[PDB]
Amino acid sequence: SHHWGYGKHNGPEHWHKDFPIAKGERQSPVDIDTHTAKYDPSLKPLSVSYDQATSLRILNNGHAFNVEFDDSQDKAVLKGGPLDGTYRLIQFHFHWGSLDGQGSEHTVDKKKYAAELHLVHWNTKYGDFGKAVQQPDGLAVLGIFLKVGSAKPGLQKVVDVLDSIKTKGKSADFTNFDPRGLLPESLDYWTYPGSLTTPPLLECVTWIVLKEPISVSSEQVLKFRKLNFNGEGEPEELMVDNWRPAQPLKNRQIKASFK
Ligand SMILES: [S]
Ligand SMILES: [Zn+2]
């Protein structure tokens, strides 16, 4: 440690020293054992309403890049599934690897994907993001896996702006991006109660992990690997492998929306 990161000296195995909740009872990510996940017919279909989404900016925060959305009103929301209430989209970001064989946070039957997209939403009953993180049902994160295959056209606008936010603290205007181009065809999912996967690791997330991965091209993922963890004019450390390994499931059941 000193500030946390993904290196040898401040990586996930060290987080517990500054954030004791790292060894909590509802930590994320986890491995999804498909044969043990319970089909639950009481789960409703997810409802994604992203047609009025307003993207604002893209920022390199030193551990990933976030695309942020205007969440001052009910423009891009998620509801249904295992959720009660309306969850507003605030930001999305990815986790990726130094090689195609790793990168995702969640695994499926121990399979790791090249990357993992997180769409972050907060429960509107709490009024703001900072209050939602303090509640057991404060956030809803939709996780989508990426496999390397064909290019994903709806991801290119993202890939193209990375050069302008190469180093930590850099940001760029990023209006009119439509997150609908990042969804797979099927919205079948697994769900379980967990946490944020970076410090502060708060246990306030209802995870909704989609069964169907989207494919990206190798060239697309390559550009992610060109970003830097460091700030401008500091020694160069490529932003790769910014994923936390799977944590113990403990007393939790993974439910499936399908069989
Ligand atoms: S995350
Ligand atoms: Zn994440």
mmCIF file of C-alpha atoms and ligand atoms in Angstrom:
data_model
loop_
_atom_site.group_PDB
_atom_site.id
_atom_site.type_symbol
_atom_site.label_atom_id
_atom_site.label_comp_id
_atom_site.label_asym_id
_atom_site.label_seq_id
_atom_site.Cartn_x
_atom_site.Cartn_y
_atom_site.Cartn_z
ATOM 1 C CA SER A 1 0.000 0.000 0.000
ATOM 2 C CA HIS A 2 0.433 3.738 0.118
ATOM 3 C CA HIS A 3 -2.512 4.453 -2.283
ATOM 4 C CA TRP A 4 -4.168 1.209 -3.464
ATOM 5 C CA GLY A 5 -3.770 0.038 -7.051
ATOM 6 C CA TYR A 6 -3.157 -3.214 -8.846
ATOM 7 C CA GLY A 7 0.594 -3.572 -8.444
ATOM 8 C CA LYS A 8 2.601 -6.087 -6.444
ATOM 9 C CA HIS A 9 2.943 -3.689 -3.571
ATOM 10 C CA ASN A 10 -0.611 -2.153 -3.367
ATOM 11 C CA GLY A 11 -2.695 -4.733 -5.156
ATOM 12 C CA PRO A 12 -5.873 -6.468 -4.087
ATOM 13 C CA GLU A 13 -4.155 -8.717 -1.507
ATOM 14 C CA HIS A 14 -3.198 -5.584 0.422
ATOM 15 C CA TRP A 15 -6.539 -3.750 0.390
ATOM 16 C CA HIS A 16 -7.731 -5.154 3.709
ATOM 17 C CA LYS A 17 -5.124 -3.099 5.634
ATOM 18 C CA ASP A 18 -6.812 0.201 4.675
ATOM 19 C CA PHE A 19 -10.319 -1.254 3.965
ATOM 20 C CA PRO A 20 -11.067 -4.050 6.456
ATOM 21 C CA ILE A 21 -14.433 -4.670 4.737
ATOM 22 C CA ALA A 22 -12.299 -6.317 2.026
ATOM 23 C CA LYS A 23 -12.638 -9.518 4.100
ATOM 24 C CA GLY A 24 -16.404 -8.949 4.601
ATOM 25 C CA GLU A 25 -19.255 -11.426 4.150
ATOM 26 C CA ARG A 26 -20.617 -9.958 0.901
ATOM 27 C CA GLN A 27 -17.573 -9.111 -1.219
ATOM 28 C CA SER A 28 -17.401 -9.077 -5.018
ATOM 29 C CA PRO A 29 -16.577 -10.334 -7.594
ATOM 30 C CA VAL A 30 -17.323 -14.097 -7.238
ATOM 31 C CA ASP A 31 -17.103 -17.156 -9.449
ATOM 32 C CA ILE A 32 -20.572 -18.076 -10.892
ATOM 33 C CA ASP A 33 -20.968 -21.837 -10.567
ATOM 34 C CA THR A 34 -23.651 -22.456 -13.162
ATOM 35 C CA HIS A 35 -24.733 -25.849 -11.827
ATOM 36 C CA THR A 36 -25.317 -24.443 -8.294
ATOM 37 C CA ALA A 37 -27.078 -21.177 -9.316
ATOM 38 C CA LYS A 38 -30.782 -21.592 -8.561
ATOM 39 C CA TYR A 39 -33.352 -20.755 -11.223
ATOM 40 C CA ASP A 40 -35.868 -18.357 -9.634
ATOM 41 C CA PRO A 41 -39.163 -18.016 -11.541
ATOM 42 C CA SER A 42 -40.192 -15.165 -9.273
ATOM 43 C CA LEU A 43 -37.576 -12.957 -10.923
ATOM 44 C CA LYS A 44 -38.978 -10.509 -13.448
ATOM 45 C CA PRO A 45 -37.287 -9.503 -16.708
ATOM 46 C CA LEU A 46 -34.954 -6.574 -16.429
ATOM 47 C CA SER A 47 -36.171 -3.213 -17.797
ATOM 48 C CA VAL A 48 -33.440 -1.025 -19.287
ATOM 49 C CA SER A 49 -34.598 2.461 -20.399
ATOM 50 C CA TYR A 50 -31.612 4.166 -21.916
ATOM 51 C CA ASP A 51 -33.218 6.044 -24.807
ATOM 52 C CA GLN A 52 -32.891 9.421 -22.982
ATOM 53 C CA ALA A 53 -29.346 8.822 -21.663
ATOM 54 C CA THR A 54 -27.164 11.938 -21.582
ATOM 55 C CA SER A 55 -23.418 11.208 -21.531
ATOM 56 C CA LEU A 56 -21.253 14.118 -20.358
ATOM 57 C CA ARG A 57 -17.606 13.202 -20.092
ATOM 58 C CA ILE A 58 -14.968 10.513 -20.040
ATOM 59 C CA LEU A 59 -12.229 10.568 -17.394
ATOM 60 C CA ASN A 60 -9.116 8.501 -16.585
ATOM 61 C CA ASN A 61 -9.252 8.277 -12.766
ATOM 62 C CA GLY A 62 -6.023 6.349 -12.409
ATOM 63 C CA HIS A 63 -7.661 2.930 -12.114
ATOM 64 C CA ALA A 64 -9.980 2.742 -15.156
ATOM 65 C CA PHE A 65 -11.794 5.206 -17.386
ATOM 66 C CA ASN A 66 -15.317 6.228 -16.572
ATOM 67 C CA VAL A 67 -17.943 7.597 -18.986
ATOM 68 C CA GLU A 68 -20.280 9.751 -16.764
ATOM 69 C CA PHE A 69 -23.939 10.523 -17.315
ATOM 70 C CA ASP A 70 -26.230 13.264 -16.219
ATOM 71 C CA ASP A 71 -28.178 11.637 -13.280
ATOM 72 C CA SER A 72 -30.078 14.765 -12.106
ATOM 73 C CA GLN A 73 -33.299 13.224 -13.511
ATOM 74 C CA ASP A 74 -34.729 9.866 -14.497
ATOM 75 C CA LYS A 75 -33.223 9.729 -17.974
ATOM 76 C CA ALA A 76 -31.344 6.412 -18.102
ATOM 77 C CA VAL A 77 -32.779 3.942 -15.569
ATOM 78 C CA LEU A 78 -32.850 0.294 -14.747
ATOM 79 C CA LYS A 79 -35.743 -1.391 -12.946
ATOM 80 C CA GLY A 80 -37.366 -4.828 -12.713
ATOM 81 C CA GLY A 81 -35.200 -7.951 -12.353
ATOM 82 C CA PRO A 82 -34.550 -8.449 -8.643
ATOM 83 C CA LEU A 83 -34.868 -4.672 -7.967
ATOM 84 C CA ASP A 84 -37.437 -2.675 -6.076
ATOM 85 C CA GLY A 85 -37.580 0.930 -7.248
ATOM 86 C CA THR A 86 -35.750 2.948 -9.852
ATOM 87 C CA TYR A 87 -32.025 2.963 -10.321
ATOM 88 C CA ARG A 88 -30.387 5.763 -12.282
ATOM 89 C CA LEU A 89 -27.297 5.304 -14.406
ATOM 90 C CA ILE A 90 -24.399 7.442 -13.203
ATOM 91 C CA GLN A 91 -21.382 5.929 -14.990
ATOM 92 C CA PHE A 92 -19.922 2.912 -16.800
ATOM 93 C CA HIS A 93 -16.301 1.608 -16.839
ATOM 94 C CA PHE A 94 -14.384 -1.572 -17.738
ATOM 95 C CA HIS A 95 -11.881 -3.944 -16.183
ATOM 96 C CA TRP A 96 -9.423 -5.634 -18.593
ATOM 97 C CA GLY A 97 -6.324 -7.755 -18.759
ATOM 98 C CA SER A 98 -2.796 -7.690 -20.098
ATOM 99 C CA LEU A 99 -3.752 -10.753 -22.235
ATOM 100 C CA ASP A 100 -6.939 -11.959 -23.798
ATOM 101 C CA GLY A 101 -7.198 -14.844 -21.357
ATOM 102 C CA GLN A 102 -7.895 -12.630 -18.334
ATOM 103 C CA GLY A 103 -9.443 -9.307 -17.517
ATOM 104 C CA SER A 104 -12.979 -10.001 -16.174
ATOM 105 C CA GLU A 105 -13.784 -9.720 -12.443
ATOM 106 C CA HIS A 106 -16.648 -12.312 -12.350
ATOM 107 C CA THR A 107 -15.864 -15.713 -13.740
ATOM 108 C CA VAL A 108 -18.287 -18.356 -15.017
ATOM 109 C CA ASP A 109 -17.435 -21.905 -14.050
ATOM 110 C CA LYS A 110 -13.930 -20.470 -13.523
ATOM 111 C CA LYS A 111 -13.796 -19.060 -17.067
ATOM 112 C CA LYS A 112 -12.246 -15.575 -17.266
ATOM 113 C CA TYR A 113 -13.267 -13.217 -20.131
ATOM 114 C CA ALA A 114 -11.038 -10.590 -21.790
ATOM 115 C CA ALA A 115 -12.878 -7.765 -20.043
ATOM 116 C CA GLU A 116 -15.877 -6.787 -17.981
ATOM 117 C CA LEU A 117 -18.135 -3.754 -18.414
ATOM 118 C CA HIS A 118 -19.852 -2.268 -15.377
ATOM 119 C CA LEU A 119 -22.884 -0.003 -15.725
ATOM 120 C CA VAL A 120 -23.309 1.664 -12.337
ATOM 121 C CA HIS A 121 -26.791 2.696 -11.087
ATOM 122 C CA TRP A 122 -27.995 4.198 -7.745
ATOM 123 C CA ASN A 123 -31.412 3.814 -6.017
ATOM 124 C CA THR A 124 -33.370 7.056 -6.408
ATOM 125 C CA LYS A 125 -35.060 6.687 -3.000
ATOM 126 C CA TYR A 126 -31.702 7.732 -1.511
ATOM 127 C CA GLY A 127 -31.565 11.079 -3.388
ATOM 128 C CA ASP A 128 -27.867 11.028 -4.341
ATOM 129 C CA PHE A 129 -25.021 8.626 -5.077
ATOM 130 C CA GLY A 130 -23.105 9.387 -1.829
ATOM 131 C CA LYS A 131 -26.191 8.348 0.233
ATOM 132 C CA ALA A 132 -26.968 5.260 -1.886
ATOM 133 C CA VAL A 133 -23.500 3.658 -1.197
ATOM 134 C CA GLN A 134 -24.292 3.615 2.537
ATOM 135 C CA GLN A 135 -27.342 1.352 2.003
ATOM 136 C CA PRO A 136 -27.650 -2.418 1.503
ATOM 137 C CA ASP A 137 -29.786 -1.881 -1.665
ATOM 138 C CA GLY A 138 -28.201 1.412 -2.728
ATOM 139 C CA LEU A 139 -26.608 0.405 -6.058
ATOM 140 C CA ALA A 140 -27.355 -1.863 -8.960
ATOM 141 C CA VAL A 141 -24.416 -2.834 -11.233
ATOM 142 C CA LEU A 142 -25.106 -4.536 -14.590
ATOM 143 C CA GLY A 143 -21.970 -6.572 -15.466
ATOM 144 C CA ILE A 144 -21.339 -7.613 -19.136
ATOM 145 C CA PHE A 145 -18.484 -9.801 -20.250
ATOM 146 C CA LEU A 146 -16.380 -9.109 -23.343
ATOM 147 C CA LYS A 147 -14.832 -11.875 -25.459
ATOM 148 C CA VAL A 148 -12.389 -11.158 -28.360
ATOM 149 C CA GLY A 149 -13.962 -11.870 -31.709
ATOM 150 C CA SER A 150 -15.678 -9.442 -34.083
ATOM 151 C CA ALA A 151 -15.583 -5.658 -33.498
ATOM 152 C CA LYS A 152 -18.420 -4.037 -31.563
ATOM 153 C CA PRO A 153 -19.382 -0.986 -33.560
ATOM 154 C CA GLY A 154 -21.079 0.802 -30.649
ATOM 155 C CA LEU A 155 -17.785 0.705 -28.734
ATOM 156 C CA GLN A 156 -15.671 2.565 -31.351
ATOM 157 C CA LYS A 157 -16.546 6.089 -30.217
ATOM 158 C CA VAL A 158 -15.094 5.065 -26.821
ATOM 159 C CA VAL A 159 -11.956 3.532 -28.265
ATOM 160 C CA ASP A 160 -11.269 6.568 -30.399
ATOM 161 C CA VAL A 161 -11.193 9.100 -27.510
ATOM 162 C CA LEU A 162 -8.785 7.133 -25.293
ATOM 163 C CA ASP A 163 -5.746 8.912 -26.753
ATOM 164 C CA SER A 164 -6.994 12.148 -25.221
ATOM 165 C CA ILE A 165 -7.278 10.797 -21.615
ATOM 166 C CA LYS A 166 -4.140 8.704 -21.602
ATOM 167 C CA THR A 167 -2.961 9.656 -18.072
ATOM 168 C CA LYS A 168 -4.609 9.964 -14.687
ATOM 169 C CA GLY A 169 -6.675 13.063 -14.090
ATOM 170 C CA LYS A 170 -7.243 13.753 -17.801
ATOM 171 C CA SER A 171 -10.811 14.210 -19.014
ATOM 172 C CA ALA A 172 -12.711 14.942 -22.216
ATOM 173 C CA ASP A 173 -16.157 16.026 -23.233
ATOM 174 C CA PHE A 174 -18.116 12.989 -24.338
ATOM 175 C CA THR A 175 -21.694 13.906 -25.275
ATOM 176 C CA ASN A 176 -24.275 11.989 -27.173
ATOM 177 C CA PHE A 177 -22.929 8.449 -26.554
ATOM 178 C CA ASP A 178 -25.696 5.825 -26.447
ATOM 179 C CA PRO A 179 -25.071 2.968 -24.055
ATOM 180 C CA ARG A 180 -27.610 0.834 -25.896
ATOM 181 C CA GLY A 181 -24.870 -0.104 -28.401
ATOM 182 C CA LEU A 182 -23.157 -2.026 -25.554
ATOM 183 C CA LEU A 183 -25.931 -4.529 -24.725
ATOM 184 C CA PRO A 184 -25.975 -8.133 -25.851
ATOM 185 C CA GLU A 185 -29.155 -9.377 -27.553
ATOM 186 C CA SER A 186 -30.405 -11.382 -24.521
ATOM 187 C CA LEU A 187 -30.964 -9.913 -21.064
ATOM 188 C CA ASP A 188 -30.939 -13.257 -19.214
ATOM 189 C CA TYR A 189 -28.929 -12.848 -15.973
ATOM 190 C CA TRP A 190 -27.597 -14.152 -12.733
ATOM 191 C CA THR A 191 -28.015 -12.026 -9.573
ATOM 192 C CA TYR A 192 -26.555 -11.945 -6.073
ATOM 193 C CA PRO A 193 -25.860 -9.458 -3.276
ATOM 194 C CA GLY A 194 -22.308 -8.077 -3.239
ATOM 195 C CA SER A 195 -20.039 -4.990 -3.108
ATOM 196 C CA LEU A 196 -18.042 -2.399 -5.050
ATOM 197 C CA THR A 197 -14.991 -4.142 -6.509
ATOM 198 C CA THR A 198 -12.659 -1.224 -5.772
ATOM 199 C CA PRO A 199 -12.031 0.560 -2.450
ATOM 200 C CA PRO A 200 -14.051 1.514 -0.506
ATOM 201 C CA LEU A 201 -15.512 -1.966 -1.217
ATOM 202 C CA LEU A 202 -18.917 -1.074 0.347
ATOM 203 C CA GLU A 203 -21.451 -3.889 0.477
ATOM 204 C CA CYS A 204 -24.224 -1.939 -1.178
ATOM 205 C CA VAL A 205 -24.592 -3.648 -4.588
ATOM 206 C CA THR A 206 -27.207 -5.866 -6.141
ATOM 207 C CA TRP A 207 -25.135 -7.386 -8.972
ATOM 208 C CA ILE A 208 -26.909 -8.272 -12.245
ATOM 209 C CA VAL A 209 -24.481 -10.244 -14.448
ATOM 210 C CA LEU A 210 -25.639 -10.976 -18.008
ATOM 211 C CA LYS A 211 -25.213 -14.457 -19.332
ATOM 212 C CA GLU A 212 -24.388 -13.430 -22.902
ATOM 213 C CA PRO A 213 -21.033 -11.762 -23.562
ATOM 214 C CA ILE A 214 -20.608 -9.101 -26.239
ATOM 215 C CA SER A 215 -17.690 -9.551 -28.623
ATOM 216 C CA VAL A 216 -14.997 -6.915 -29.242
ATOM 217 C CA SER A 217 -12.134 -6.996 -31.688
ATOM 218 C CA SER A 218 -8.601 -7.600 -30.623
ATOM 219 C CA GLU A 219 -7.737 -4.098 -31.924
ATOM 220 C CA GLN A 220 -10.419 -2.574 -29.750
ATOM 221 C CA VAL A 221 -9.078 -4.228 -26.558
ATOM 222 C CA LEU A 222 -5.552 -3.358 -27.606
ATOM 223 C CA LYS A 223 -6.326 0.358 -27.319
ATOM 224 C CA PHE A 224 -7.538 -0.098 -23.739
ATOM 225 C CA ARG A 225 -4.063 -1.438 -22.862
ATOM 226 C CA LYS A 226 -2.455 1.824 -24.021
ATOM 227 C CA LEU A 227 -3.825 3.828 -21.143
ATOM 228 C CA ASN A 228 -1.739 4.768 -18.127
ATOM 229 C CA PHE A 229 -2.244 4.364 -14.407
ATOM 230 C CA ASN A 230 0.227 7.232 -13.889
ATOM 231 C CA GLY A 231 -0.248 10.989 -14.194
ATOM 232 C CA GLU A 232 1.295 13.081 -16.935
ATOM 233 C CA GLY A 233 5.075 13.320 -16.804
ATOM 234 C CA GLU A 234 5.412 10.482 -14.268
ATOM 235 C CA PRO A 235 7.060 7.221 -15.231
ATOM 236 C CA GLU A 236 4.814 5.160 -17.498
ATOM 237 C CA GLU A 237 2.824 2.256 -16.057
ATOM 238 C CA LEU A 238 0.347 0.746 -18.561
ATOM 239 C CA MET A 239 -3.238 0.393 -17.268
ATOM 240 C CA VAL A 240 -3.673 -3.422 -17.524
ATOM 241 C CA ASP A 241 -5.042 -6.093 -15.248
ATOM 242 C CA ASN A 242 -7.165 -3.633 -13.192
ATOM 243 C CA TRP A 243 -9.381 -6.519 -11.971
ATOM 244 C CA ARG A 244 -9.981 -7.959 -8.503
ATOM 245 C CA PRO A 245 -9.892 -11.728 -8.203
ATOM 246 C CA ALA A 246 -12.942 -13.761 -7.151
ATOM 247 C CA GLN A 247 -13.875 -13.676 -3.416
ATOM 248 C CA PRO A 248 -15.551 -16.328 -1.229
ATOM 249 C CA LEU A 249 -19.296 -16.714 -1.743
ATOM 250 C CA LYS A 250 -19.859 -17.358 1.961
ATOM 251 C CA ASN A 251 -23.520 -17.450 2.922
ATOM 252 C CA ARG A 252 -24.878 -16.310 -0.482
ATOM 253 C CA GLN A 253 -26.966 -17.886 -3.203
ATOM 254 C CA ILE A 254 -26.639 -16.955 -6.844
ATOM 255 C CA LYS A 255 -30.088 -16.850 -8.538
ATOM 256 C CA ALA A 256 -30.609 -17.265 -12.289
ATOM 257 C CA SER A 257 -33.399 -15.642 -14.332
ATOM 258 C CA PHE A 258 -33.324 -18.605 -16.787
ATOM 259 C CA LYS A 259 -32.870 -22.388 -16.922
HETATM 260 S S S B 1 -16.117 -1.799 -9.922
HETATM 261 ZN ZN ZN B 2 -16.046 -2.127 -11.961
#
